[PDB]
Symmetry: D2
Subunit: 232 residues, 4 copies
C-alpha cells in the first residue's frame, strides 16, 4: 500500500501546502476565496480562482495496474447578490501536476473550448448549451459535458457539506451534497476509469468561476479533507 491523508478545519493565509492560482486567495478569517469581490462583498464578473494541494497523489500504477481509492470532503458556500441571475459554478477535481487554469465562466476554469486530462465533480449554476435545466451536480470526465448530472437544490449564503468517493474496486464514483440548515440532500453516482482518464500522479483542488458579464455568485471553500489508498 501507499497512503496519504490530510484535514483542515480552516485555511491558513499563506500556507505552504497549498497552491493558489488565478484570483484565489485565503482570508484572514481562514476562508479559501476562489473569486474576487466588492468592498460590499459583491462578486466581480469574469473572475477565476483555482486552488490545489501541493503534494501530488499517486492515483494509479502502471507496473501493478493498481488503482487508488480515495475520498474527499469540504464545507462550502456561495453568495449571490441576485439569485435570479447566477453563474457560473464551482468544481473539485484531479489533474496533471503541471496543471494550470483553462477557460473561464462556463468552462469552470477546467476546460478550454476545443479539446489537460481532468476529472471533475461540478456544482453548476449556469445553463450552458450543453447543460440541463437547473443548477446541478455532474461528473466530468475530460469534458465539460457531464456523463451524468443531478438536480442540485442550492441555497444561497447557506453552508453545504460535500462528500466524494472513489471505489477502485467498482470503479464507481459517488458524490453527495447535504445542507444541514435545510435538511436537504443530493447524491449522484457513476463509473469512471481512472487509468484511461488520468496520469499515475495527479494534483487535486478546487476551481470556480463567475459570470462572464455578470457577478453571479462567489464561491468560498471552508474546510477540507482527503484520504487515499493505493494498494499492491
Amino acid at each position: 500500500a501507499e497512503t496519504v491523508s490530510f484535514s483542515w478545519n480552516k485555511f491558513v493565509p499563506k500556507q505552504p501546502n497549498m497552491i493558489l492560482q488565478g484570483d484565489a486567495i485565503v482570508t484572514s478569517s481562514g476562508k479559501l476565496q476562489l473569486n474576487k469581490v466588492d468592498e460590499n462583498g459583491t462578486p466581480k464578473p469574469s473572475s477565476l480562482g483555482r486552488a490545489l494541494y501541493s503534494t501530488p497523489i499517486h492515483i494509479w500504477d502502471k507496473e501493478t495496474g493498481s488503482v487508488a481509492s480515495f475520498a474527499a470532503s469540504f464545507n462550502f458556500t456561495f453568495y449571490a447578490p441576485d439569485t435570479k441571475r447566477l453563474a457560473d459554478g464551482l468544481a473539485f477535481f484531479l489533474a496533471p501536476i503541471d496543471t494550470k487554469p483553462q477557460t473561464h465562466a462556463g468552462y469552470l476554469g477546467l476546460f478550454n473550448e476545443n479539446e489537460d486530462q481532468v476529472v471533475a465533480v461540478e456544482f453548476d449554476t449556469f445553463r450552458n448549451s450543453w447543460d440541463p435545466p437547473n443548477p446541478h451536480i455532474g461528473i466530468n470526465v475530460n469534458s465539460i459535458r457531464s456523463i451524468k448530472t443531478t438536480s442540485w437544490d442550492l441555497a444561497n449564503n447557506k453552508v453545504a457539506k460535500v462528500l466524494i468517493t472513489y471505489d477502485a474496486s467498482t470503479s464507481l464514483l459517488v458524490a453527495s451534497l447535504v445542507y444541514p440548515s435545510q435538511r436537504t440532500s443530493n447524491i449522484l453516482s457513476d463509473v469512471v476509469d481512472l487509468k484511461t482518464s488520468l496520469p499515475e500522479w495527479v494534483r487535486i483542488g478546487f476551481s470556480a468561476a463567475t459570470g462572464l458579464d455578470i457577478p453571479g455568485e462567489s464561491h468560498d471553500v471552508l474546510s477540507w479533507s482527503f484520504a487515499s489508498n493505493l494498494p499492491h
Copy 2:
C-alpha cells in the same frame, strides 16, 4: 473522548461478538441471514430475524450532555421469488441493551401495534397504511411512521451498499444507499435528537421481516462497519 469501532468483511458462524435473535443466523458462507428459507432458498412468511452487536455503545452522556457521532455501513441483498409481491423490509437500528423483538411483518420487528425506545433507518418494501407509495427508505424515531422517507430504487438479488451518518453537532442523520451494479443511488437526511430518543447506552443491529401471508423477500447482511465517538 470515548471511541469504539469495528469492521467485518464476512460473518463468522457462532461469532461471540454478536447476538442473534429470532430466525437470524450466520451461514457457512459468512452471510448474516435474517429470515428463514426453503431448501430451494425461497423465503418463509411470518419470519423474523434480528442481530445485534454485543458491546453496548455509549451514545450520550448525562453529566457532560455530550452526544456521540457515529457512522455505519454494510453490504446487503434481498431475494424475491416474485417481485410483484414483496414484503416486508429490513432495518438498522439502535435500541436499549435489554432489547428484544417486537411485532413482525409491517412492524419490522421493531415496533409493537400500540406504543422500547428505538431509532431506525428502514428499507421498506411494503405499503402499510402509514406508508407512502413505493418501497422507500425512512427515519424512524420511536415509531414505525417515518418522520421522513424517500423513494428507494430497489433491485432484487443485486448488492446494495449503505451509508449512515450521525453528526452530533448538527444532530443530523443521513442515509445513503447505492447499487454499484446499476449505477444508482438514494439519499435521505433529517434531524434526530439522540437524547430525547434513547438511553445513554444502546445496542445496534439489524432487523428484518417477511410477509405475513407471503414470502416476499429474504434479507441477508453481507458485511458490516461501525465507528463512534463521544466527546468531552
Copy 3:
C-alpha cells in the same frame, strides 16, 4: 480483515463494556482501582482485582491460520505506603473468554501454583523464587516464569505510560514503559506464538495483586486503548 478498536480517557462507573472481577472497581473519579484500600487510602494485603473488556477478540483463525496484530496502551500508577516493602504487581493479559481469577499475590491472579491459557506482560514488584533481582517487566507465556524480563525503573505515585505491540508477521511482542515525569523509559521484546498459546477468541484485561502479608502497593489504571487487526 476483521478489526476492532476502542479508547477511553477515563473509566465510567458501572460501564457495561467492562467486566470487573475480584476486588476491582471504578471510582467516581474515573479510576480503575484494582486493589482494596484504607480510608487513608492505604492498600489492603491479600487483595486481588481483575478487569476485562466485554467483547471477546478474535486473535487467530483456524481455517486461514491468520494471526491478529494488536496494540494496546494505558496510563497507570501505584501507591506504596512503604517503598522498601512492595508487592506484588500488575499485569495486562489475554485469556480465554471463560476466564476467572487464579492465585493471588506472587501469581498476580493469573496463574495457579501447579499448571487457563494466558499471555501476559507483567509489571513485577516482588522477588519470587522464580524472579530476577529488582522490579521488572516480563513476558509470560503460560507461566509466571517470564521467558524474558527487564529492569523496570518504577516510580511510586508517578504516572507511567505503557505500550504493547504484537507483530503477527514477526510474531514479536514488544513492551515499553515510559515515565514522562522522570524522562525515563524501558523496553522489552521477544517472540510469542499466539496460536500455540491461546484460543482463537480471547478476552483482554488487567490483573493486580497486593502483598500476601503486606500492603505493598495499590494499582490504578487510568486510561486505556486497544486496536486489533486480523487478516485474510
Copy 4:
C-alpha cells in the same frame, strides 16, 4: 485541528512527493539509498545523502501557541564491509523548509562545525570527541552534541525497525529501535520544546554520512510512516 499523514511500504523511483539531496537516490528495487556504493556494493567514503518529504508540516502555531504531536517510523539497514571500522551514521530530522545539507561525516550532514534550526534523532556509529562510547542513539536539539543518548545494539546487514514519538502535552520525545531478527530493543526519551527549537513549518527527512577516509557503512531506508496532529 490540522492533520496530515502518509505511509509507503516501498520507495518509487522518481516519486514527486520526495526530495533527494546529495548522493541520495531510490533503487529500482524500491530502496532509499542514502550513500554511494561500489559495484561490489561497498560504500564510498566522504559520501552524503539526504531525503525529505515534499509537503512541509505545520509543527507549531504562533497565534494559538498550539504544538503538534507527531509520530514516525521506518525500516532501515546498514552495510559494513568491516565492522571494526564504522562510520559515520544516519539521522531522522526536522528542519526549516529551505533546508540544505550541512557538514558531512561526523556532522551527519545536519550540522556545520560552528553554529539551520534542526531537531534530530541520531543513529551514531562513530566516536567523535563529543560522542560517548559505542554506537548509540541520541537526541539532537540544534547541536551534534546529543542532550541524551543511549547504547544502540546495532546489527550489520540486519533490519532494524524504528519508532519516534512526540507528545506535545508532555513535550516528550521518545525513540525506540527494535531488531526483530535478534529479539533486541533500545529506547530513549527526553523533553524537547518544539517552539524554541524550530519554525512553525518544517520539513522532515533522513540524513546519512560515510566515513571521511573510510567506507564505514551504507545506510538504506526501506519504508516510511508519518502522522501528525496540530490542535486548536
